[PDB]
Design a protein around this ligand. Structure first.
Ligand code: SF4
Ligand SMILES: [Mg+2]
Ligand SMILES: [Mg+2]
Ligand SMILES: [Mg+2]
Ligand SMILES: [Mg+2]
Ligand SMILES: [Mg+2]
Ligand SMILES: [Mg+2]
Ligand SMILES: [Mg+2]
Ligand SMILES: [Mg+2]
Ligand SMILES: [Mg+2]
Ligand SMILES: [Mg+2]
Ligand SMILES: [Mg+2]
Ligand SMILES: [Mg+2]
Ligand SMILES: [Mg+2]
Ligand SMILES: [Mg+2]
Ligand SMILES: [Mg+2]
Ligand SMILES: [Mg+2]
Ligand SMILES: [Mg+2]
Ligand SMILES: [Mg+2]
Ligand SMILES: [Mg+2]
Ligand SMILES: [Mg+2]
Ligand SMILES: [Mg+2]
Ligand SMILES: [Mg+2]
Ligand SMILES: [Mg+2]
Ligand SMILES: [Mg+2]
Ligand SMILES: [Mg+2]
Ligand SMILES: [Mg+2]
Ligand SMILES: [Mg+2]
Ligand SMILES: [Mg+2]
Ligand SMILES: [Mg+2]
Ligand SMILES: [Mg+2]
Ligand SMILES: [Mg+2]
Ligand SMILES: [Mg+2]
Ligand SMILES: [Mg+2]
Ligand SMILES: [Mg+2]
Ligand SMILES: [Mg+2]
Ligand SMILES: [Mg+2]
Ligand SMILES: [Mg+2]
Ligand SMILES: [Mg+2]
Ligand SMILES: [Mg+2]
Ligand SMILES: [Mg+2]
Ligand SMILES: [Mg+2]
Ligand SMILES: [Mg+2]
Ligand SMILES: [Mg+2]
Ligand SMILES: [Mg+2]
Ligand SMILES: [Mg+2]
Ligand SMILES: [Mg+2]
Ligand SMILES: [Mg+2]
Ligand SMILES: [Mg+2]
Ligand SMILES: [Mg+2]
Ligand SMILES: [Mg+2]
Ligand SMILES: [Mg+2]
Ligand SMILES: [Mg+2]
Ligand SMILES: [Mg+2]
Ligand SMILES: [Mg+2]
Ligand SMILES: [Mg+2]
Ligand SMILES: [Mg+2]
Ligand SMILES: [Mg+2]
Ligand SMILES: [Mg+2]
Ligand SMILES: [Mg+2]
Ligand SMILES: [Mg+2]
Ligand SMILES: [Mg+2]
Ligand SMILES: [Mg+2]
Ligand SMILES: [Mg+2]
Ligand SMILES: [Mg+2]
Ligand SMILES: [Mg+2]
Ligand SMILES: [Mg+2]
Ligand SMILES: [Mg+2]
Ligand SMILES: [Mg+2]
Ligand SMILES: [Mg+2]
Ligand SMILES: [Mg+2]
Ligand SMILES: [Mg+2]
Ligand SMILES: [Mg+2]
Ligand SMILES: [Mg+2]
Lengths: 231, 208, 148, 137
RNA sequence: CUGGUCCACCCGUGACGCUGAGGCGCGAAAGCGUGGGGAGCAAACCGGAUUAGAUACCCGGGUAGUCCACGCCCUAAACGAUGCGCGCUAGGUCUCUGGGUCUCCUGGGGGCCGAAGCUAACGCGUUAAGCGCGCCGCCUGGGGAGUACGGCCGCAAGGCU
RNA sequence: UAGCGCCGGCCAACUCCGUGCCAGCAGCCGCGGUAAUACGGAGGGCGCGAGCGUUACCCGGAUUCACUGGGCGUAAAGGGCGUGUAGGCGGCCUGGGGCGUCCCAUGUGAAAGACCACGGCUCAACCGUGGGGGAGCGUGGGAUACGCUCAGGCUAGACGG
């Protein structure tokens, strides 16, 4: 299921904005831009997935982390496929290091879900409607699929770790296994399970994220074939 | 010389029972039994956090006062044991208990070492036959301690003697009663006496 | 549960127009006397608040001390910026011989026998931090032969 | 260059901090004889006599500890420490009785002797001493 | 007329090397001596103003000196407040000058941000303040004081210790 | 016969009057200006105990002259810069010598004292007996990794075409 044809979907990019710790995961750069050795790319894939399914067939949670406008949207897909927590918009700091108090910001959300679910006094001054409803749409914007996480993750997944070093940091402290894809610029070492590939090509983003979820359902109860895919 | 002053003040200030006389320390007429708080104008006031020093200061005096020994006499032995082999604690302990007077009291010849000394210092005691008015004699294993034949006719001895016949004596002790002739068997270990002491704390003290 | 010890508490101070508003620091360690210890540092607008806060840390930043007979395996020597701490193996009859800060730190670690010495900026804070990772850097014949 | 030995040692200590799979050094039977000790005790992985643009070398193959969690996952060092002792500035000489025991027995000190390089223990076993090369752990 | 220096080719000597108490030489400005020179500027100086005062800041004049030659003088925030040589330790962008194959690669300098690491912090980081080896100078609370005494240097002011 | 020091923190041990920057304590930080745990007295308490305190001087804390075991960008400390004597130091390989260096043997290293065991003054202090070592240098033998020296090669530092 690892395929192999990926080569025509991402096969790396990014100029000399590289990171010295990334060279072992590069074969060259014939086009003035580094080149990712898709060989070892498998080897990690053949190592990383061996971690993914395991957690799946064990019942743990996984948190998706991707805030680029590139990966702005793909996140809510393959995640909600896997039906597990996810962070699409801003990466609220302390979202792990300070969970007990973050989470306590969802009860406010669920609660508004209760109220706005209806009656319990729509006799509240109109000023209070719109305003909460606004206060709700915000709470919903950021929390939608991290409201799902009712306990501390057994691991997470990240699109751009250098972009999400914030995210990357809190876990690494909490001993939460961190798995993610990255291209040239990111610091490997900092990763626990690695998918060294392009971190802006949706096309490549979907490939990994999609297939990753496939080994979720493929171990998380049942199977399915196609998933969403904007050209 | 030794202390020889008001004694109950010791037990009090320490916060522990030191049976420094004999009977009363068991009686309900005791201070700690009645006033287990510091002596002086400020006893019943809420004590405040003693210092790490002050702590280590205690255990000492507590022990030191237990036998009523000059501070000096209580440096030597612990310079003795400290420069003596092995765990300085046990040794020094055994070095202390090895005093005549003590053992004499440890051999139930008198309610208080205070008595022990006096009877000791009064030579009423003997050892291996020999008479010893030496309340500092370091008795060693294999020493035969006998009350003074000249003082075997005393009644105090017997009143303390009588209240001893089958009384439980230390593992490192015997008491051929009647014959008024005990005997000192060996040198003890810490577990042989559960004194209200943390000897290491006194170790920490002179470590200054 | 464990056993707590307060090495130090101090009142800081901040200058604001109309006075100098204060704030207290709490140096707090905690140990079982059986391999585990912890040292956080507490700050709170009042004394007991900081102490309790520290203990929460003191038990969130732990370490495993491979004791042996009451002493340590090997003589460790670590500098924390300016404070330098010395830790040496001692024998049974010895008894801990360290300043309050290290003593307090080492005592709850169960150590009965150790030689010590503070050097340089023996500020109880830094001297403490360095004291910890001195223990955080102690090792075993197994740990040794393991890596070999 | 003054002392290649410390330089040798220095080269090592310099790479072990950056986590190099290997590193190189100008060669010498003495440097090798040393290195001989440094794998038989297990601080290194061993060396092979390589050769750079015409010149001999000793690419030493480095050994390190395991990956770790926490925030600093970097593998603990095998050679926690490695410093020169006897030097050209101060040649240091020991008799068998005055031979130190590194870090209570967890480390060693390489010694040059009339009976070949030895470790702090090997000498005491062979009953000799010499120019304390260095102590390492 | 002459010095140092860099790059290439990898031709020759084959450890001939680094450091360097002493010694010696160089040493911006001011200053000194002798003989020139003297437009502009400009200590002291005179004058006019501001000020309670203004032996100053601003303005009008103006002497030495700033310029040349030969002698001294030898100090300074003479600073990178960072001694010199060598080896080891990610890189990124800019610039000077070289060599190549001319995309780019490699040598030597000049800046910038930054890996690990150091550091009391501010900060440094292949031009280290990082890990090291060698050698020289140097520090040991502040002031008194870079003063006194002695000795050396100097025409003197003054310098060194 | 019981006397002395101490009781603001260091540093164990608390209240009351007198006093009011006065008379006074003080080893350092500092106490007193009408509510002094800091002077004086008293009560009480802390520590030793025929002793208790002070002064003086020595080591310690002082890691503060740093061999163990410090340091020089802004905290005190890089010489203004070079050249070069003495000196210190010195890259790869082979052989001889065996200076440092290492091992063994051995003579000296008096006794007293220090250290362990025990024995006599009723203990101890004191003294006796035996036991157990070294550094250092003198003599003989040995080994040769590093330092050095003598000799032979090399070219990775330097110098040169
Ligand atoms: S035992 Fe009781 S009566 Fe005896 S000294 Fe102690 S407190 Fe006083
Ligand atoms: Mg990217
Ligand atoms: Mg002992
Ligand atoms: Mg002492
Ligand atoms: Mg912190
Ligand atoms: Mg200091
Ligand atoms: Mg201090
Ligand atoms: Mg371990
Ligand atoms: Mg040394
Ligand atoms: Mg040639
Ligand atoms: Mg030739
Ligand atoms: Mg020179
Ligand atoms: Mg000049
Ligand atoms: Mg001039
Ligand atoms: Mg003139
Ligand atoms: Mg003249
Ligand atoms: Mg003229
Ligand atoms: Mg003119
Ligand atoms: Mg003018
Ligand atoms: Mg006037
Ligand atoms: Mg005027
Ligand atoms: Mg004027
Ligand atoms: Mg003019
Ligand atoms: Mg003139
Ligand atoms: Mg003039
Ligand atoms: Mg002039
Ligand atoms: Mg002139
Ligand atoms: Mg000069
Ligand atoms: Mg400048
Ligand atoms: Mg320069
Ligand atoms: Mg200067
Ligand atoms: Mg230097
Ligand atoms: Mg060009
Ligand atoms: Mg450059
Ligand atoms: Mg920078
Ligand atoms: Mg860093
Ligand atoms: Mg340093
Ligand atoms: Mg440069
Ligand atoms: Mg120099
Ligand atoms: Mg002075
Ligand atoms: Mg001075
Ligand atoms: Mg001057
Ligand atoms: Mg003069
Ligand atoms: Mg002068
Ligand atoms: Mg006193
Ligand atoms: Mg007082
Ligand atoms: Mg007060
Ligand atoms: Mg005292
Ligand atoms: Mg107190
Ligand atoms: Mg007084
Ligand atoms: Mg003050
Ligand atoms: Mg008053
Ligand atoms: Mg006396
Ligand atoms: Mg002194
Ligand atoms: Mg001390
Ligand atoms: Mg010392
Ligand atoms: Mg220093
Ligand atoms: Mg200065
Ligand atoms: Mg300079
Ligand atoms: Mg020379
Ligand atoms: Mg050589
Ligand atoms: Mg030779
Ligand atoms: Mg020789
Ligand atoms: Mg002798
Ligand atoms: Mg005897
Ligand atoms: Mg003798
Ligand atoms: Mg000895
Ligand atoms: Mg000898
Ligand atoms: Mg000989
Ligand atoms: Mg030879
Ligand atoms: Mg030489
Ligand atoms: Mg030659
Ligand atoms: Mg060359
Ligand atoms: Mg050349």
């Amino acid at each position: 299921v690892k395929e192999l044809l990926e080569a025509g979907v991402h096969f790396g990019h990014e100029r000399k904005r590289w990171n010295p710790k990334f060279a072992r995961y590069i074969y060259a750069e014939r086009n003035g831009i580094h080149i990712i050795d898709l060989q070892k790319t498998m080897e990690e894939l053949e190592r990383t997935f061996r971690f993914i399914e395991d957690l799946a067939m064990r019942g743990g949670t996984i948190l998706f982390v991707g805030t680029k406008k590139q990966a702005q949207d793909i996140v809510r897909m393959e995640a909600e496929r896997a039906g597990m927590p996810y962070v699409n918009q801003r990466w609220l700091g302390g979202m792990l290091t300070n969970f007990k108090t973050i989470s306590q910001r969802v009860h406010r959300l669920e609660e508004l879900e209760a109220l706005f679910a209806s009656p319990e006094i729509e006799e509240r001054p109109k000023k209070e409607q719109v305003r909460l409803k606004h206060e709700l749409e915000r709470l919903q914007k950021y929390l939608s699929g991290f409201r799902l996480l009712k306990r501390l993750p057994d691991a997470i997944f990240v699109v751009d770790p250098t972009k999400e070093a914030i995210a990357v940091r809190e876990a690494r402290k909490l001993f939460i296994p961190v798995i993610a894809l990255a291209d040239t610029d990111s610091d490997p070492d900092l990763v626990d399970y690695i998918i060294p590939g392009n971190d802006d090509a949706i096309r490549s983003i979907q490939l990994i994220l999609s297939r990753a979820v496939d080994l979720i359902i493929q171990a998380r109860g049942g199977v399915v074939e196609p998933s969403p895919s904007y050209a | 010389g030794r202390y020889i002053g008001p004694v109950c003040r010791l037990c009090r200030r320490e916060g522990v029972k030191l049976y420094l006389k004999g009977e009363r320390c068991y009686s309900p007429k005791c201070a700690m039994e009645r006033r287990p708080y510091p002596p002086g104008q400020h006893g019943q006031k809420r004590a405040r956090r003693p210092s790490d020093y002050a702590v280590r200061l205690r255990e000492k005096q507590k022990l030191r006062r237990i036998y009523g020994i000059s501070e000096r006499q209580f440096r030597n032995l612990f310079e003795e044991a400290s420069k003596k082999k092995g765990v300085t604690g046990s040794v020094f302990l055994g070095l202390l208990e090895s005093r005549l007077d003590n053992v004499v009291y440890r051999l139930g010849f008198a309610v208080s070492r205070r008595q022990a000394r006096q009877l000791v210092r009064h030579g009423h005691i003997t050892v291996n036959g020999r008479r010893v008015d030496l309340p500092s004699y370091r008795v060693r294993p294999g020493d035969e301690i006998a009350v003074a034949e000249k003082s075997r006719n005393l009644e105090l001895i017997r009143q303390n003697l009588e209240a001893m016949k089958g009384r439980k004596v230390g593992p490192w002790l015997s008491l051929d009663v009647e014959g008024m002739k005990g005997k000192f068997l060996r040198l003890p270990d810490r577990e042989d006496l559960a004194l209200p002491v943390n000897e290491q704390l006194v170790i920490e003290f002179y470590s200054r | 549960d464990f056993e707590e010890k307060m090495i130090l508490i101090r009142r800081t101070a901040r200058m604001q127009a109309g006075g100098r508003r204060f704030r207290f620091g709490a140096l707090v360690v905690v140990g079982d006397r059986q391999g585990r210890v912890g040292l956080g540092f507490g700050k709170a607008p009042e004394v007991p608040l900081a102490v309790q806060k520290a203990g929460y840390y003191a038990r969130r930043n732990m370490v495993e001390v491979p004791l042996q007979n009451g002493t340590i395996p090997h003589e460790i020597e670590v500098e924390f910026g300016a404070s330098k701490i010395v830790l040496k193996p001692a024998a049974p009859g010895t008894g801990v011989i360290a300043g309050a800060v290290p003593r307090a730190i080492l005592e709850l670690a169960g150590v009965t026998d150790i030689l010590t010495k503070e050097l340089g900026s023996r500020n109880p804070i830094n001297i403490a931090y360095a004291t910890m990772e001195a223990l955080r850097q102690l090792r075993t014949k197994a740990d040794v032969e393991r890596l070999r | 260059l003054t002392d290649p030995i410390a330089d040798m040692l220095t080269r090592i200590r310099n790479a072990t901090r950056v986590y190099k799979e290997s590193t190189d050094v100008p060669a010498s039977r003495f440097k090798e004889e040393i290195l001989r000790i440094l794998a038989r005790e297990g601080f290194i992985k061993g060396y092979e006599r390589v050769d750079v643009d015409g010149k001999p070398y000793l690419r030493v193959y480095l050994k390190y500890g395991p990956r770790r969690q926490g925030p600093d996952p970097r593998p603990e060092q095998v050679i926690h420490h490695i410093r020169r002792i006897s030097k050209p500035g101060r040649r240091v000489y020991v008799g068998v009785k005055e031979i130190p025991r590194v870090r209570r027995g967890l480390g060693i000190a390489i010694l040059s002797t009339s009976k070949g390089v030895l470790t702090d223990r090997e000498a005491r076993k062979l009953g000799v001493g010499g120019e304390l090369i260095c102590e390492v752990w």
